[PDB]
Amino acid sequence: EADCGLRPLFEKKSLEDKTERELLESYIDGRIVEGSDAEIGMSPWQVMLFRKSPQELLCGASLISDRWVLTAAHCLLYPPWDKNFTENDLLVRIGKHSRTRYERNIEKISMLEKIYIHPRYNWRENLDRDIALMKLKKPVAFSDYIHPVCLPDRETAASLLQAGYKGRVTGWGNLKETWTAPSVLQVVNLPIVERPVCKDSTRIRITDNMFCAGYKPDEGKRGDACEGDAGGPFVMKSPFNNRWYQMGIVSWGEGCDRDGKYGFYTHVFRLKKWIQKVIDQFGE
Secondary structure: OOOOOOOOOOHHHOOOOOOHHHHHHOOOOOOOOOEEEOOOOOOOOEEEEEEOOOOEEEEEEEEOOOOEEEEOHHHOEEHHHOEEOOHHHEEEEEOOOEOOOOOOOOOEEEEEEEEEEOOOOEOOOOOEOOOEEEEEOOOOOOOOOOOOOEOOOHHHHHHHOOOOOEEEEEEOOHHHHHOOOOOEOEEEEEEEOOHHHHHHHOOOOOOOOEEEEOOOOOOOOOOOHHHOOOOOEEEEEOOOOOOEEEEEEEEEEOOOOOOOOOEEEEEOHHHHHHHHHHHHHOOO
């Protein structure tokens, strides 16, 4: 997608959001609060996935072109809970900022024509290959508020996804919502964690198709990975072309009863073969 990742209200107006520079420099400040309300149109690829009946927020997702939305598989299909949502059970809401209000002349509601779950999705064990695509019934018209994120290529994947570098999760806290057993869009900047520390920190068997971001419980940081929505976008800005790239999809978070624990994310580039195939073969 030629114009992907350049936000109409920032990169296009040559404006910078409050914390993108810290992201570009991988800068870790001594400050404790690392999460805040999102500025208007800071994350315009942000999608809400809704159950039609009863109406309710199921998951996050992201816009990757006028016809395609990306999310996590376990948002749509999860047999242990008898979860199998059809195209006909769901709506997507794009261009939103506040959760608890319909936002006319800003947001757009689309129907789904078809769902594509990764064939090797593994719910039995660890949510390996936790990825799905949703083809919109109708192409959606872009605005200042609705704009697709880029997907990484080989070189972008290689430079950007390294332990120590900093990405960004946006969402309305649905990872918190599901498990405690806040209405404006949240942004949190989180660093990518070394693989052995991700391995060490969780009980799940992690695979190379996953990465984790967040802070050691050492530093008192209260920038939370659970501000994410399951299915939602983990993004990073390239210092080479000024574009936003979706490097991750929120799969789960650890200690969403406030712990300062890592979020786990589907490694998008690693599954790009499947993504491209459905987009190329089953699209236009």
